[PDB]
Amino acid sequence: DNGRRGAPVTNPGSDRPLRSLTDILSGKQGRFRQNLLGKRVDYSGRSVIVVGPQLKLHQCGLPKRMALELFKPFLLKKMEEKGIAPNVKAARRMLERQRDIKDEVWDALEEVIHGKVVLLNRAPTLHRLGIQAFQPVLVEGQSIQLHPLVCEAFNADFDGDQMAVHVPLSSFAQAEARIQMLSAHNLLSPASGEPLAKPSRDIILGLYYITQVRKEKKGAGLEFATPEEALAAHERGEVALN
Amino acid sequence: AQGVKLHDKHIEIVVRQMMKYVEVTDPGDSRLLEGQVLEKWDVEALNERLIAEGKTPVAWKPLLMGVTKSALSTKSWLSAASFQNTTHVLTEAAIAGKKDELIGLKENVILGRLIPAGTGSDFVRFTQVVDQKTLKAIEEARKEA
Amino acid sequence: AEPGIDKLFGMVDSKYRLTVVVAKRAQQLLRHGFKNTVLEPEERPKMQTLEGLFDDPNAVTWAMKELLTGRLVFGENLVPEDRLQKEMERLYPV
Amino acid sequence: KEVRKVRIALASPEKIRSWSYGEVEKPETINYRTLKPERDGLFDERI
Amino acid sequence: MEIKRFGRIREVIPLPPLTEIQVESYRRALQADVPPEKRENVGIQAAFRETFPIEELVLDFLEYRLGEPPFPQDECREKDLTYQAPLYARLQLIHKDTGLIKEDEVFLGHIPLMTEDGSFIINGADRVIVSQIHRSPGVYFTPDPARPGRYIASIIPLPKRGPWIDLEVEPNGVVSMKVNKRKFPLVLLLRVLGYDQETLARELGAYGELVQGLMDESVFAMRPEEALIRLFTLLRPGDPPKRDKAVAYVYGLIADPRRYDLGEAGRYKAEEKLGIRLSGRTLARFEDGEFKDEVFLPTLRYLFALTAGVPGHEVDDIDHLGNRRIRTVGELMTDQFRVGLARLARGVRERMLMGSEDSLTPAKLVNSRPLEAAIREFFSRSQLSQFKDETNPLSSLRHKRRISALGPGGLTRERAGFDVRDVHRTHYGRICPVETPEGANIGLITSLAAYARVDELGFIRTPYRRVVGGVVTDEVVYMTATEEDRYTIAQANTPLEGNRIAAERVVARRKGEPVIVSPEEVEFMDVSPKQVFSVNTNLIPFLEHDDANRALMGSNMQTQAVPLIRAQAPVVMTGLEERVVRDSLAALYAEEDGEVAKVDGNRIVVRYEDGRLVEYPLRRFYRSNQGTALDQRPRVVVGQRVRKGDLLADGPASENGFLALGQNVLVAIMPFDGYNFEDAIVISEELLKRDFYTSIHIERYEIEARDTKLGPERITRDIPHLSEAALRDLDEEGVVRIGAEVKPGDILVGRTSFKGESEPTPEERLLRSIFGEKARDVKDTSLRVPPGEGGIVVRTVRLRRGDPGVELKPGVREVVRVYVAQKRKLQVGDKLANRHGNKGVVAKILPVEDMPHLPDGTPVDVILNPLGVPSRMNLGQILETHLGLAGYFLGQRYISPIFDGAKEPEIKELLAQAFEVYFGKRKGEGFGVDKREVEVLRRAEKLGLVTPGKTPEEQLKELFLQGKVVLYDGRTGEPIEGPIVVGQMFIMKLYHMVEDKMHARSTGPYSLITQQPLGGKAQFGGQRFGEMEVWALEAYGAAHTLQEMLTLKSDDIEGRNAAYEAIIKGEDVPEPSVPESFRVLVKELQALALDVQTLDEKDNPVDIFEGLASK
Amino acid sequence: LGMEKTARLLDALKYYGFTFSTTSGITIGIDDAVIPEEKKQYLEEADRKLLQIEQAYEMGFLTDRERYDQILQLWTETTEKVTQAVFKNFEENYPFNPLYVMAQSGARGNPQQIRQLCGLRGLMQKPSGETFEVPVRSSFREGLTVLEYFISSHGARKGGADTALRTADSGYLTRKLVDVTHEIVVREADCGTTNYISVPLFQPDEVTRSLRLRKRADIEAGLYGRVLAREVEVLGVRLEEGRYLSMDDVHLLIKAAEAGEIQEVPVRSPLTCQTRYGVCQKCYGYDLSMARPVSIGEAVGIVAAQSIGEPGTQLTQGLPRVI
DNA sequence: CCTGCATCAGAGCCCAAAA
DNA sequence: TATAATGGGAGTCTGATGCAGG
RNA sequence: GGGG
Ligand SMILES: Nc1nc2c(ncn2[C@@H]2O[C@H](COP(=O)(O)OP(=O)(O)OP(=O)(O)O)[C@@H](O)[C@H]2O)c(=O)[nH]1
Ligand SMILES: [Mg+2]
């Protein structure tokens, strides 16, 4: 444990204490909190998020170029089953150069992702909804499209936020995600029990505007014995409709 | 006051962990020492073995500790050593010859195991699926000598 | 939302038990090439390609649909695990 | 067999020696010309 | 077009030279243009004078000189060289024993030179030195928090130039002194100064109980020498108290004008506060063999008088900008210079003992290595020496005027709390209250106010106009914070008739506190509203209408504006955008009067009155640090008559000399089908068609070919097993041809490296034998193109060893650089913002036929959701749009100064005049009011927008004066059911662009010890799935998903190899195995002599190493 | 109707809501921030009051403390007054005004932000914590003065620095909570305990020195989704032992209490659960995200730590009291 | 017995991170 | 492998807990 | 130093 007792041992001509066995095990950068309770992972990606009003609640926009990398092993197997490449090794060689990618390969990827979901995460992950599952819809373009109703649970804006993508690999992972983690199956807060995916911003704005009623000042509460008198009074332009 | 609707249900879970531990006032007829701190569960478990052995049971006191101290005291030394105060936790554990039974989540996360929650709980873990065709097929051959 | 997800949560004592039955079932189908399915040819999930209609490759979709039919039996200690594997590989090869 | 438990305990000097494949006798690391490890040093392949 | 300027404020002085804080600081330190005999004792000169003469033998300092730079600025940037001058020093050696004198001029290495715009070139990269705010040296008195009626006097010198002192008065009644965190009774130190009980009684005594509490008899029972020995035993236990040793320790700590330096500001603050005069910068002296006090007794005197409540004694506020000073470039560099000089002296004294006490000159006695390293250490690695922000000219101008409270000699992040981050009342006119980072650094990093300048002592000063009687003079006085608090300062907008104060009641400040005062009481007046804010904040029009939290974002983001090929200045300016281009040095001006002889893409030649045919070459497509293109364009024609200071070429992000950070677009403020949701922005495809928001960007690629123990890396066109299709765009030598389109995977520079002892495995041997191709000696290491990058190859630089002028780092044969450019059209995910802090990403690009449009057929450019305005409270953008509407039809641009601006009525006059052109054209063209315009007018009178009972023209003009127009939806053709706000807004394209940020990985590089995926896009890293992410998966109970993250997708080696094989074979992924980073954990605990044992249910050991680690 | 249909309902509400907002004609021009006529009146009233408090100072009737305290109180009330004026003028004479529409519907905005647009900015704070006596009389529509702007900057910076130092304290807090509860999981259906807790429906009130009904949302937080420990009959309804309380069940219990039939509710709780290393289905109750009994195996401790930690960001005692 | 008083171990996440 | 040489140079703020002291 |  360096520095524990006495002057910390340093390399010559540096103030940096040398990193001892104790420093490796402990702390934020330590073995436990860096490589053991959390890790960097394969089959993941990240990009800028963009709003996607046209999506259904269970969907996300996924750039095709991102999807090709995340599913690359799947894409290689599928490219052999149909026929774009003789075998797995040659197929990978074709994706390496971007001009060597033909258009049939994009149709090949579409077959692969059918029914599978991906995970969206946005940091900070404050509660269990910082990660939700979405079925991806391939898009041209470099941006992730996020469904409007889920922005609240994620505390997402479009002021330049980015999100991370993860691919659950096994049949077991995919099942857990589609049943337990699907955005549409978590509609209520685990904290308060109240609705989480709910109208906000424009959605509220539109619905309030069409359901509000006019109240006009021209008539100003006159009495009329017969209703046919009233319509006549309005026809004179003495009394407003509402 | 800050306008946050939150169920008491959650705060009670945490407070329950704050009260997890007790301090011995008299051991009576046990190996414990006066002033020794231990989980309330373990001393309740011990006391029914003593009251069933007839010897005088252990006298204990409710003990309230904040979340940090409570977190550092759980039996699992992998949980405590991954939290904080890593050297202290680890030196006392190595002396005691402590065994982590891998009860909680963090222990299993560290080993890369399938956690004891969700699809990993022993309640749902072993559930089998079989189609009526296969259920009856296996069933007919075995109902005989 | 997954189709008929509410009815599926109805079938189980614990939502996580649903996930296991579905996940294990999808593994049975993939290993055996779908030929142990309890579904009938018009109930088979289909996938629209550029060529045209083919069988849905996703076995997890299949398993949930199969479950909804009622033709699957789920529980604990239904059959020794190894013996089940041999009887299934005997009825529907690999 | 399957891992059900993790124990941590003190190591005797005998046991510390029970692990060891050799004694590191020299502060040397690797040879400055060949770039291969120095015999009996910290990277020695014999150990 | 015409430029209409509002505002009544006459600014008596222009903004100071804006980069002067940099240029003037360093010029003063080097004094290179001053003849040595005329140098004042400051900066570099002062460092030499402080370190010399060096005692034993004596080495004495004569003078220094600075040479000229070996290479010019452009050349240095090219070759990864530092821009610097050779330094020499004339030294005379004296032998204190003999009489011998040998004198020689020794070479001390190089010193980096500052360019004209205030930046540096360090190893080829342009750098900035950020000024550091800190506590001024001096003597301060603060209240002791523990005892509510007692105080602590702290004597703080310049950083690293002495200890901190505390004079707490202890509960026992005796006055205690604190040095290096150790305490003793202060009376003991007083006796060492030669003080007797009489002096302390007669001087102070007036405070009955305090002066007697300092008196201790045992201390008096000894002459000044014995008291010195007594104190030393307290400070250094175990060191024998030899009389020469004790004097040395105490002298170096207290009286030595080499080891203890109060500031020059410290001397002034001390002399002014205690009412004494200091003979030097030290707390005491060594004179006539004993010590003579200077500071200590006056500091003790002030403390007792303060505790007693004597008039004229106050506590000091330590965040006041009079007691807080700025350390500029010269001072920071000089501190590092002083350290490097003292280290070289260690070498001198040690060499004056070894090797013969005679045959030594000054040239052999001096080793310059310590000095060179200290200067190189400061510039290449200090945390105040930063990579220049040169995204656009304003980026670097702002960077140079920043003030940091962090760095070597200041707060840490973990070490910093509220008092320092606050906006102090004295920040008025000196440090900008707006421009600060949001997040952890709030209040620590700030920006110099526009009219502020840093004086010789390091205090920030701000200008005010003198007011005599009621008449305002034109004489301007720059004041420090301490001196400003004496007077009564009227606001800059107070009404004037001529030079006379025209109001009976004026708005003024006394010590920052706002007060209403009669014109008889007015001593000074603000120069301008501009003096209160930073340069970036001063670029925000209608700032008086914006909430501060949003104004901040406006300031900071202009720094991030990317230079656009079509860049334009905003239609509503503040009047500073002209000055910023000029002080930045991005553009180009005419030196004297003259006539333009020639104008080229590459150069402009001007013939002046002098007859000289000065040639100005133009910088074309140079790549800045952030990859935005800095390029200058000619603005004059052959034969054009120019006067002195007229524009010749426009720099990047400038248009006819005004700062152009963006484009002026026609905007509609209205929701659009949820593409507007939560700040996203919808834009018209017309913008890409006409190349608005297109910017050029260059990325730099580099590769070295070096000597290895296995043989040379060679850069060649011959690369094993590659088709001619792959090599087509490569020249003869293996370098890509200039003017080729390269896309991801393409080879930029071909290179071969000799194969390791992995000399092909027998598996490869048999395969190679089948095809009858010898396994080649070299493998293909060619430099290629990263995922997602690429463009057109615009340049190549190749540098070998054995070519004139070039020597690489040892072992390196050759270095090749390829510069690749791309034209970036605006796309979905690129980020836009205006100057008021509305910022959002482009979520939708609609074809022009879908865009909402005016009745006369003109489609709008941008659709911004109104839901962004009310919570944000940034209304300047709204007023900006209205004045922008008038300007669209009248064909004009405006200057509306901050806080003295266009006001609502004046904008209304302008808006009415526009309506005539928007409508009168129509009435004459033979068209009447539209059917749909009536339907909207119907809806508008229900809203109270128009007055009922007027002609449609009368009502439409009523809406047009509220800045609203009728808008037709291009999808339906039907009107929007209400009038919509439409006008011209200035919007910038910021530096965050999806092309740079999109990243994904299947599998890739792993870390050495942990075997987990690397981080970051450039390494093809995996995403970090951290502690909180695991919690997310845990709370859902998704165990198999989580286990995948912890094993197959990270460091489980057997599992991840096996999992990939399964996916490409169509099998399901296997159940995971033990993660490798746990095995590392186990072995690391064994290195700590702890036995970690994995056990089964039977309590038997389980081997997770599968036999590999057991004998 | 359940989740599947609610997903469809949400998407439908999403679809039409967006479409109507576009054609509605909602915009914001500067004239949409309407200075109420009542403002000038309320300002004239405030100046005569302030002058009267000055007479009581230089004549020695009131102290410096008393004078400053009285000034702040006067300006607080004038602020409240002007807000009501803004919202009354909107409702009566301009009910479809864009600012008004956004605030009232909950699309964006709150009364205090709108007051700064059309009203006065109000009182600003000194660098310490004490408030300036002089307010900012301008609104963002009228525009401020450099001096008003500068006085206001102090509070902005203090708010920004407070928030920055709080997220770290909240972040740390959450990590403690996960670590103390992480092992807690729902491990069985019923532990069998006979113990429970009594949720009070009435809090002893200091002002009446007796009893008043606890507030609605508070009771909902203590009651919704809990299993009843004992049978409860109120208003002729039998709430059985073992029944999960529906939100409707809770509203019924509140109504019975308003009628004096029931003062507290016996309920199963995790405090009293006897399950080792976690809780059981009954003492937990509803899985609040599915509005139905929790499934065995749900990692409940983690959800408790996340539910408590997530709000930490937005808390103004404040968060220090929670820690 | 009790209280000052020191020595120690804590201080949010993810991404660029321009070496 | 030989005049004689003999004692060093250098840098915040919080809460919890185990310790010499009126 | 910069993004949320
Ligand atoms: N934890 C953390 N979150 C950050 C950080 N920087 C930015 N954020 C995110 O920034 C977001 C701020 O969103 P706001 O736009 O202020 O959300 P709001 O409450 O709707 O405020 P308005 O949009 O003005 O109405 C939060 O959701 C944070 O998650 C950071 O450094 N740490
Ligand atoms: Mg955001």
Ligand SMILES: [Mg+2]
């Ligand atoms: Mg927001």
Ligand SMILES: [Zn+2]
């Ligand atoms: Zn229970």
